[PDB]
Every structure is written in C-alpha cells, then in structure tokens.
Amino acid sequence: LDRADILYNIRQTSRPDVIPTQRDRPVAVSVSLKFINILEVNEITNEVDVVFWQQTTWSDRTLAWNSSHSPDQVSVPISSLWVPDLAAYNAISKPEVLTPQLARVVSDGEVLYMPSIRQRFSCDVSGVDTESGATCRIKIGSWTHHSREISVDPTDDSEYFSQYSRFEILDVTQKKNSVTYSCCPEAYEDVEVSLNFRKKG
Amino acid sequence: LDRADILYNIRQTSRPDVIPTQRDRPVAVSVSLKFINILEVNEITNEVDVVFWQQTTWSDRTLAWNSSHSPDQVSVPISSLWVPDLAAYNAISKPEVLTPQLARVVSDGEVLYMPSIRQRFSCDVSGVDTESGATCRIKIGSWTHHSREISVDPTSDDSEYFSQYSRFEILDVTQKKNSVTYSCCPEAYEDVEVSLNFRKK
C-alpha cells in the first residue's frame, strides 16, 4: 500500500455519516483548546473574541490499514471522514476555521483534527482589567449524540499564546460535565474550559 | 440493522425534496424557541440581535425502520432529509446556524432538528429599560406550504437556558398560533408568534 491506495480506500469506504461506535460503547473524543489570541474583549456586553487550536482526537477503526511496508499516516479532508459534531454552547458566532480542513489518520485508526478557530463567546468578562483577571468559561460538547454514543474528555497554558496580544493568560483549567436537558431524556457530556486572563498592565 | 445500514438506507431513499404528507393531511410541525442570549438591542431603530435554540419536530414515515435488534435513533445531516421550509417573517438578516446541521431520527420516523441560531429581527423594542420591559414578537411559519400541507404549532422555564451573562433578562415568553391569508396567494399559511418579554438588568 502507498498513500494513493490508502487515500483511495478511505474515500471509497469511510462512511462520514456513520459514528464509529464499537460494541455499543461510546466514541471517546478528547478535546483540548490551545489559546493563540484574545482579540476583542467587551466588558459591557460580556463578549469575547478568541483564537484557539482545537486539538481533537478519537478512534475510527473503519479507517485502519495494515501498515506493513506502508505509510503510517495520511492527511485526509474532513469531508471524507466522520467527525464528532462538537459545538460550543456559549458561542455567539459560527466558528471561523482559519486552517486547511484536514485531519491526520494513523494506520490503527486514530484521528487527529486540529483546526485553528476564531469564534466569539458570551462569558464573564468582569475583572479583565484587574490583577485577578477575568475567567471566561467555554463549554464544548456533542450537539446530537448522548453519553452512550459520544464521551468527551480533556486530554504550558500560554505556550502558543501570541506575545502581541493586549491580553495575557493567567491560567487555563478544564472540567468534564454530564448534563440532561429539558428537550431530551438522555445525558450529554461536555468539557468546560476556564480561561483566566487579563489586560497587560 | 446497524447504524451503517440505517444511514445508508436513509441516504439512498429519503427524498429531501418531498414533503412527507400522509393521506392529504398536513405535516404537523412543532416549533419552540429556547432563548439563549439577547446581544444587541436598539430602541431607536427597533432592532434586536438574538440567539435561540429552535426546537423543531415532525414525522416522516419514509424514514422509519424496524428497530428490532437495531439502534433506536440515528443522527442525520439535514441535507439528507426533508426539512420544513420555516422562515421568520420579521427577520432582517439570514439565520446564522451556530451548530452542526444534524437532525435526530427515531425508528418510527419522528425527527428532531434543533439548531442554535443567531438572527436579527425588526420588532418592538420600546420599554426595554423599564420595569415592564419590551415585548419583541417573532413570527415563524412555512414560506411556501399552505395550511393543508404544513401546520405549525407551539409545543418549562423561559429563562431556563438563558445566559446569566447577558445584559438583559427574560420576564416571560408566550406563544400563539395564527393562520393568515396573504394578497399574493389564495390559501392560508400558519405561523407561530413567539412573544419575548425582556428588559435591561
């Protein structure tokens, strides 16, 4: 097998429509936000404009191939793959994906998709111009798949943060939750990412 | 049947262009707005910028399958399904869908589609900064299907999912069903009017 064969096979058979659950166990999705920039904060309206890399990993065995004498990994357009239907609950704009929409697939079926996203959120901006800073909580989970189909888990904080931002990051913490909504009888998991940041002073 | 079979079958046969009327009876569509945020309000121009989950349900029997030893539900891209052609009569921007465009289909043919939408409306903003608050009325119905093809009906805490970080707060949400004949066409068109009573904190 070479890359052309692998990509041909994936394109013919991946079934992007089909969640790759194994034996009625949920697909375990890991999500981790690497913050790159904070662009346009408004303490009056409690809105924030943020740029982050959304590191997203999961397993899809239907993509796997025998890597004997073959490439161990390929880059695949996400339109040819099943991707988790993650949404940020407190987003107030649709995600603007700034990078090529390619995922990386390993021969055992492990997938990494890590777009750079600019998005606007509704969150607590109070204290942004103080030494304690503001804490903006971003909540991300599957929109349509309950906890028996998709589970979501969290995997330096300023590591890739732009030095040219007007803001600086004090801390980033994660928390996993499982919530039942009035609409539906089942539980839906999310990861809440708390971004503690402040204006440079 | 597993998920792959069900989704394959739906993709091959659903007919997204065909309204699934049963025996010349209208498709009964239920619509309910769960308000999440009020983002911009302008009392001079009478305009409002709102985020809401549009809970939309209907039945399409052509999607049904025998759920014996099979999954009870699948998530399906709306491009593979018939969806009611709902529109907001007083919208002044196109709906910005913030979430993955997937519907949930139950084995008996019941569909739920519940996108998070940000949209701007023309409505009565007067009184927003008073105790009584403003009442903004949002009118939603089928754009091209009359009352014998689509009926629309309203389906909890109004502020249930409303953001605590909004500058506004919700006092009350009420619904009302209407049937209207327009000058353009001889038939009647149903709508739901959702009255959002809100004020500045």
Add this chain to the structure above:
Amino acid sequence: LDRADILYNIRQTSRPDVIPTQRDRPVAVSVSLKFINILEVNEITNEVDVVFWQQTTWSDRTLAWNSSHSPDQVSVPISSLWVPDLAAYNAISKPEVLTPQLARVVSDGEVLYMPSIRQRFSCDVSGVDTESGATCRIKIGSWTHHSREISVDPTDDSEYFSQYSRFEILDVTQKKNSVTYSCCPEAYEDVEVSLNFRKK
C-alpha cells in the same frame, strides 16, 4: 401521480439553463415588490438599505403535468428550474436572500418565486425628513435577455411594511420601460418601482 413522481420528473427534465420561450414569443415575467422594511438611509451618500418580498411570476410549460387525481402544486428548489435573470440596475450590494429558495409550480406550468431580499441601493434620498418625503426609484430587469426573449411587467403599498421601522411609506408606483444600451443593438425591458417614503 403523487408529489414524489412530479418532483422526480421535474428534477430529471426541467432544463434550468433553458429559457422557456413559446413560439419565438417572449417569456412574460411579472414582478412586484412588497416593501417590508427600510433599515438605513443616508442622505449624504444617497444610499438606502431595504427589505422587500420580490413577487415574481412566469409560465414554463415544460414543467406542466396532468393534474387529474394528482396534486395541483409542488414547491421546487430554484436550482431545479429556469428562473429569469433579473437584476436591479442601481443595487450596490448583491441581494441577500433571507428565505428558503423555493418556487411554487402549478400543474399548468405557472411558477411563483417570492424571496424576501435585503439589498442596498443608490437612489434619491433627498427630502426623506420632510412631509413630501423622498422618492427612491428601483430599476429591475433581465440582465442578458432582450425584449423578444423576456418581457417584464408590474402585476396596498404599506400592507406588509413593518410598523417598527423608523420610516413610513407614502406611496409606491410602478412604470415599465424599454431601453437600448450602447453595448448591444436590442432593447431590454425593466420595471421601475418608485418608493415614496419619509422618516416618521
């Protein structure tokens, strides 16, 4: 025939690229604007931002079917049928269609397409804050089909106009024109819609 058959047949045969002229006579298109809102006006720049329902009707016999024991009408995505290439000559933004892009087809081939459109125009805004108001003229016609292929004709004023607009409509009148442009030897028809409005 049921709806599924009719829509299948339309999808397989409608020919959206082909103007449905009958016997070398023009396709008669009717256009009528129902103003819903006036959102922003600028008297210095002579620009206006308007929302309207563009009621558009024409006949396409290639869509017709025998309605005996069959539905009399279906809703069809406009991508599956021929639609007149109307443009507003004084638009300064592309039309933002706010509604599902569906037309309604009757079994005899009559088509109605009626999108809600938000669009910006260059027009006379002077007098908007006076009793007489401003008169903004919007000119609409086929971009590429001359008068022997497409004719355009006009069919309450503030019937659907929003009560919450800062503006109010005093009068709406229409006028049909036929114009020859320097670029091309033939005549092109348009409808000019005159919107007389003022600040409340």
Add this chain to the structure above:
Amino acid sequence: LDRADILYNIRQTSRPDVIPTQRDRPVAVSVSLKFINILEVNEITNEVDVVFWQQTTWSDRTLAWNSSHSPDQVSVPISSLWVPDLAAYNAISKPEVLTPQLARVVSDGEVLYMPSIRQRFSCDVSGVDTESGATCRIKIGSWTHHSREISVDPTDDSEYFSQYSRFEILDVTQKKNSVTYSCCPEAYEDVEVSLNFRKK
C-alpha cells in the same frame, strides 16, 4: 436546432478549462469599463469604492453552431464556458458581482460577458475635491496567461453614471500595456483605465 439543443450541446462540449487559442495565436480579449457609481473616496488612504459594468468580449469557436433555421444567440452560465482569467492588479477587495453570471454567446462563437461589479481599489485620490479632480488608474489583465495566449485591448463616459453619486466623471481614458514581472520570463498584457473624477 432550438435553444434547448444548443444549450445541451454547449453544456456537453464547451470545455471551460481550456483556453480557445486558434493556431497558436492569442485569444483577443476586449475589455471596457462603464462606470456606474463611485461610492466612497478616501484622499488619505488613497482608496476608492467603485461600481462598473465590465464589458468583456472574446471569440470561442468551439461554441459555434450552424444558425440556419436556429436561434442566433443564447445566454449561458459562465460556469459552462471558458472565461478569461482577468484580475485588477490594484484591487484591494475581491470583485462583488451584482448581476446574474450569464454570458451571451453568438452562433459564430463570439461571447459577451458583462457583469456589474463593485470593487475597492488602491489608487491616486489626491485632487478629488478640486476642479481638476482626481485620476484613479485601474489596471486589468490576465493573471496566468502571457501575451501569446491572451491579448487584452480596449474596445459618453458618464453615459450610465448615476446622477445621484456625490461624484462626477470628467474623463475616462484607456491605455494598453505589456509587462514582464520578476516572477516569470514572459510578458503579460493589461489595460489601464484612467478615471478622472471629482466631488460635485
């Protein structure tokens, strides 16, 4: 042949990806801008927002048909034919096409494509509020085809210019150029359109 046959044949065979050079001679493209509006001017940033009809003509013999007992012309979506890859060198926004994207094809293979375009440009705005006015130069040519593959030539100046603009046109002149860039060994032709205008 009727319109349906002609359009069917064009759709099946036109090859929109293939430049219709004849016998290793360049495709002769004519370009002419008819200015409709000037919407915003900035003398500090030297930027202008303009609306114009871009009259573009060329010949593509692969489109030709025998017009004996047949329509002489059809309107065709530009996605179904080859179109020159023209770009404005000093544009600072992408062209916003305001009109239906249809070209008109004559039976001998002559094509006219004439979209209404709104676009922003970087150019010399100095003098706009004086009697002499400003002269904004717009440079248009093929982006990827050199002079042996595409040649570009120019074909009342205020003829279609909006009376409601804050600006007025004093003169429009054209000039053809042929330029070698550092990137590539070959020459690339352009037309430079000089728009002399001023605030009323």
Add this chain to the structure above:
Amino acid sequence: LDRADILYNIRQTSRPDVIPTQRDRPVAVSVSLKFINILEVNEITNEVDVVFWQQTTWSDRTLAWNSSHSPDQVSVPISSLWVPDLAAYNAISKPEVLTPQLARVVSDGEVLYMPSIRQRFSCDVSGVDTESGATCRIKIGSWTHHSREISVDPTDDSEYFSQYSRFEILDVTQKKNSVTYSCCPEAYEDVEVSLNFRKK
C-alpha cells in the same frame, strides 16, 4: 497533445488529495510573499491588514507530459491539483483570495500558484510611526505535513508595493525554521517573513 488533451488528462488523473512525495523525500515547497499593500495598521490591537501575492512553487511529477510538439504549459484550477496545505500561524482572519484560483503547470511537473491574498495578522506594530518603522513577522508553513513530507523554503519583495499606500516598506527578510509542537512528535517547517514598514 494539445491543451484540451493535457487538461483532460490532468482532470482525470491528478489526485488532488495525494501529496506527490518522491521516494520518501519531502515535497520541496518554495514560498515568497510580494507585498502589494498595507491597508490598516491598528496600533491599539497590534493587528495589520495586508495584501500580498503569495508566490508558491513545487514539483508534482504525476502532472508531467511529453512536450514534444505540444504546449509547454497550461493553466489549471487548483481544485484539480494537489496544493500544499500552507497556513499563516498568526493570521486572525481567513485568507481572502482576490484573483482567479488557477495554477500554472509546466510539462515537467513544476507548478506555480500565485494568488493575491488579503489577510489580517497579529504582529508587532510598535514603532510604525517612527523612522525605524515597525517589524511585522508573518509565519507560514504546512498545517498537517511534517518535515519528511513537506519542506518549506524562501525563494525585492517590495517592487510591486502600491505607491498610494499610507505606508512604505523599508525592508523584507525571510528566515526558515523547524519547530516541534506539543501536539505532535515530529517537526514542522515554516518560513518567517519579516516586514519592516512605516507610515509615510
């Protein structure tokens, strides 16, 4: 072979999803930015709005053809070719491509793709209104292909800068880097382009 054959063959066989690595050696991509305009420099937020031609070259042997008695080059839509997945790490808007999305392919498989791009960046704007000027660093590299699959190298770049900009370019320098990120075990190459500019 004529142009129609070559383009037909490319469309049928190019495999736009497949990186054209040769013998487990990386595809060598060359990138060079030719700055055309600087449109907004926000001294509050450290954000710049820039227009540049992104000259991008690489080799794809699967595109090659025997050029004996045949055209030496064709223009090809990028949707029909593999293109490197380059991204600007400090971009804060998606790239707005202002030009026709065509690449030029030589019979030996050499590809040139050179779009005009408008994009907004986060970078050091301090000193823009001083004699030394500001230095804005733009970092560009493959998003998903590591150093054994794609290498990136720089090929002045201010020759095409608009004379009507409020800004002027003092110097442009490039630097190649190779970086390992926390997410992934391999190294990813980038080119960092330093744009030294100031207000006139």
